[PDB]
């Protein structure tokens, strides 16, 4: 005696992939086509809802990756293209009598370049880092990129400081936030709430160590797609942060020449004092406690009597084997081997860092960029909030791994899911249309 | 289990006004439709009025459509009946009862599930 | 409650918040495509309600009987013990069958209405 | 039959497939423009039906008499011997006249309805 | 008159031109965005009328009483001496209050209708 | 045959200094200018 | 045989066959290809 009754506005949804909107409260991450945020965003707790999450199939990460790359390229497009730089350089050592780790790292190179008029040439002397210059065989050198791609000079007025970005659902869609304490990236969440926009996620770019991220609510959380597959990365979210104090102690100056009508090339000039190596300091006791906590959480998956050993990264290029980050506008490549040098059986650490001006971001080949030098002395303090580890009997070996930027963004987007609202439904009632 | 207790007046003259009420407990008041049924002192039963569970819909027998108003307050668990005019044929014991209607998403009733004790209305 | 607050509530209780979810359905190339798709989806749902004769209602009763095979639960279990997410999962396989019958019913009703209007 | 299968059928028979054509109306810059125009066209037709008081119907009767000048054929020829394409061609010149009268009729009906509702 | 010709006329007289303004609501990236916004605005207004139970009418009566505080003018002043622009300005602060009450009224009506339909 | 509808008894307040039609006209004119110049010869050999 | 105007000698005639005719085309020489770089990331391929 029951009849079909049609309802519209039914609170049900299906998994869906859609385009999310940018919201934000010159900067390379500043977006003009991005809406101001809501000063009073809402969150609606969903009682008795157990939504299943899977951070490894979350399409918000792919959009974040594409949006970040797109903004990067848009920022670099309206800037000076340094085609006159791929010339033969004649170089000598900047500080021939230096016994610190900086011996041979800075070279004093001479080249002809171009001028505003096509009829003239000039002679330019500048300093380059060893890592940006390849020997041809004073000695003859070329820039490392001349064998791969052209250089676009970053505009010196555009900052690299991360700006928190909020992703907002379009109408008809909603973002579900897990909020389940100790959620490991997969499975049901019992504290699911509905939001319009995510929290502000800073597009912090780093390798091996994740900086300026969120912290775990109660304990270190180890997340992986498949914890027994040694081809996958392990994302470790710390519950407490570790400060890392990074510096470029030398007081450097910057010189500038014109290379064409309206074009100017900025370069590293004299060092106003001693040449000193960039480095980062991590307190030993804090790291030792953090690493012990990580080991306990690994033991929960690998065995109470398994030996957990940490070691430095082995093969690969400098970008993957070091901790890469942007500090003060300079790109630092820190050794890190002193942090992964221990075997776990049931005052400060100084990390040498190198500076490079010619970089190849996002693991792309063919789009190289030159970072202008920064005037003065650089110091920054960052919060280490998580680690990326890879796994190599009775002993397991872990290494920093890293290099795939989507993993860094997974560490922030793991708690959000996008769903589509399906407002129609039917149900039987004792209600007959007359 | 379910206690329905009517309260009301005594002797009223024709052309007057009399209000009855029914208190209820032991069940969720707002989940059931309610009605009033009257029995003349020497006769059988007849239905007088019906109110929905939400109170928005009321139904009456033709003989009281212009005289009786039925209402309920679900926070006070109270059913009320306001009667005007009250002719001699209206003398009866008036019972409040639970049941008689169901709000589409509930199974059918079409019966009076619980009865009170009854107020005596004398004209 | 607010948007989707009733998602975990019973089918009966959640039927009282239909306007909350309804309002939130409407509330460079990739974003224009997303907005155009949102509009096309909304319009397809409104067209479907129109075809069934439910163009102006959030709760609409029809003349299609429940076939039992679709679900043999009584009204008390469906409206008091289930959520709309569970119901949606339970009868997903029969959604198009129900939709087809709803369309057929309205077509017959429209013809019958026209024939009644033709009587002098 | 399927979409437009009734195009060559008589006006009476083709009136039984209105939901088939109705569903198929909704079913980088150049494509976005085409989709936006399709939506705007659909909405203009729905608005026009709303103005006439036919917002929820596929078959809608009104209070405008047939003027004879528009077409002096009897119902048997129109509904049994003609297709909708032939009818559309035959009265194209009078389409706007009919539309104007339909709008006027609904405006009077709305006022009359309001006046009836005002009676205590 | 034509589009907005009644803008300076009294509220009563201007109520007779509702179809003129209604037709003119529907009538590269920046232009596509403007057109998509125009469609979204139109659809939000139609959805709002639907929520109130006025989906097919230009003039729609409801069950919400006038609260007096909103405006204590009599009908003669409002309909014969004021324009719609003046009225819109006069009660702007109470628009959302009125809208909220209208939604509540329709929700109760829908439930009551369903309950009446359930009677055998 | 463009239309103009006189609005009787309407006193709209205007402010030409806050008129956003001017900013659009400015941007549209600059955009057309640049589009016209884009598909043309770039005289880099002249700076000699 | 299809044409816009079969009597206008300024128009083309499109002839659609009911049967196909095979045409066997070849470049019989065994050629090699050499490649040089002409700029950062640029390479020119040529007939050797
Ligand atoms: C993790 O977060 C911390 C804290 O937010 C962050 O450290 C901060 O970095 C910024 C940027 O380097 C520091 O702000 C600078 O401070 C120097 C002081 O000498 C100023 O000169 C800088 O201004 C220059 O650059 C501006 C660029 O917009 C110019 O507009 C300006 O005119 C100057 O040229 C700037 O104010 C900030 O002080 C630190 N905070 C601390 C506590 O050290 C860290 O970098 C983040 N880590 C990562 C990896 O992003
Ligand atoms: C790079 O080396 C050149 C010399 O090979 C430096 O130029 C000389 O600087 C001294 C002063 O210290 C002058 O007396 C010489 O006349 C300069 N030589 C020429 C050819 O100009 C140059 O300064 C060095 N670069 C830096 C940054 O110090
Ligand atoms: C610059 O060009 C001149 C020729 O004009 C050449 O003699 C000189 O060696 C060049 N400088 C360098 C550093 O190659
Ligand atoms: C030139 O580029 C190739 C990659 O295309 C690289 O393997 C090679 O080592 C580079 N040359 C030098 C001298 O590094
Ligand atoms: C879920 O939420 C409740 C109340 O907000 C809380 O008591 C409970 O601990 C939460 N569960 C988890 C796993 O965080
Ligand atoms: C680092 O963590 C401390 C303690 O939570 C906090 O006060 C500080 O602001 C954090 N710094 C950054 C850059 O997140
Ligand atoms: C972090 O986790 C450890 C246990 O692994 C615990 O002792 C410590 O208090 C936690 N810190 C915070 C801030 O929750
Ligand atoms: C995450 O939690 C789920 C719970 O079902 C478990 O099956 C899975 O193995 C866990 N993964 C890791 C890496 O802890
Ligand atoms: C994890 O990887 C191992 C090794 O390839 C495989 O046997 C196992 O089935 C995988 N587990 C899942 C859940 O994919
Ligand atoms: C970093 O610098 C702060 C002062 O700004 C100091 O308190 C902290 O101990 C330093 N950290 C390390 C590891 O040296
Ligand atoms: C600290 O470092 C020592 C190094 O010998 C190691 O034995 C110990 O396990 C580490 N952790 C703690 C909590 O002491
Ligand atoms: C490891 O020790 C914990 C106690 O802290 C125990 O609950 C767990 O079962 C042990 N696992 C194994 C494999 O022995
Ligand atoms: C880091 O330092 C260690 C010191 O033993 C060295 O062996 C290793 O090659 C260094 N890594 C890089 C990338 O320079
Ligand atoms: C690993 O630790 C041992 C003991 O402190 C040390 O001798 C060795 O050099 C370390 N390895 C690296 C790469 O620093
Ligand atoms: C660098 O040297 C210049 C010149 O002596 C001086 O003005 C400037 O303050 C120095 N900067 C720092 C950070 O010492
Ligand atoms: C969640 O379940 C409890 C227990 O049945 C119920 O009291 C509560 O109202 C439910 N939440 C909602 C939003 O209905
Ligand atoms: C219920 O549906 C089945 C098809 O799944 C059909 O055979 C049966 O006749 C239907 N029941 C009624 C009463 O029509
Ligand atoms: C609904 O079905 C269940 C399962 O058979 C039964 O226990 C319950 O009493 C039924 N309720 C009604 C109202 O028929
Ligand atoms: C729907 O079909 C799937 C197979 O695709 C089956 O597993 C599921 O149980 C079916 N559900 C119902 C309600 O028939
Ligand atoms: C086509 O015409 C024939 C002859 O009148 C008729 O029988 C047939 O049904 C027509 N086709 C359709 C689709 O109505
Ligand atoms: C039919 O239309 C004509 C105008 O074409 C009009 O003059 C005539 O009066 C109309 N017929 C009726 C009955 O109104
Ligand atoms: C319709 O008009 C035609 C032509 O005058 C005539 O032959 C036919 O009989 C008419 N039919 C009816 C039903 O009047
Ligand atoms: C419509 O007008 C055209 C002239 O533009 C005329 O040839 C045609 O016959 C007219 N049709 C009708 C039905 O009046
Ligand atoms: C303008 O005002 C005058 C005077 O009240 C009135 O006669 C006229 O009709 C008004 N205009 C319109 C379009 O109503
Ligand atoms: C009119 O609105 C006020 C709130 O502004 C409210 O307090 C008052 O009760 C309303 N009037 C009536 C008759 O409800
Ligand atoms: C309307 O109110 C005004 C102002 O009090 C009064 O002069 C006028 O007579 C009233 N009209 C009616 C019809 O009550
Ligand atoms: C509406 O609020 C404003 C203050 O924001 C006030 O000046 C105005 O008089 C109010 N209008 C009404 C009709 O209450
Ligand atoms: C194509 O066929 C039509 C049939 O009306 C004829 O008029 C025309 O001349 C033909 N054209 C050719 C090129 O055969
Ligand atoms: C074909 O071309 C000839 C020569 O120009 C012309 O006379 C004739 O009218 C044309 N035919 C058509 C159908 O255009």
Numbering used by the authors:
A (entry chain A): 33 to 57, 66 to 141, 150 to 185, 188 to 309, 312 to 323, 323A, 324 to 397, 412 to 457, ...
B (entry chain C): 1 to 52, 52A, 53 to 82, 82A, 82B, 82C, 83 to 100, 100A, ...
C (entry chain B), D (entry chain I), E (entry chain G): 520 to 546, 572 to 664
F (entry chain E): 80 to 127
G (entry chain F): 272 to 309, 312 to 321
Sentences from the study reporting this entry:
The N332-GT5 molecule was designed to engage antibodies containing a specific HCDR3 motif (derived from BG18) but bearing diverse VH and VL gene segments. N332-GT5 was designed to induce diverse human BG18-class type I precursors. We conclude that N332-GT5 consistently induced BG18-like type I B cell responses in RMs.
We employed cryo-electron microscopy (cryo-EM) to determine whether N332-GT5-induced BG18 type I BCRs engaged the N332-GT5 trimer with a BG18-like binding mode as predicted by the sequence analysis. Overall, we conclude that all three BG18 type I Fabs interacted with N332-GT5 using a BG18-like binding mode, which supports our sequence-based definition of a BG18 type I antibody.
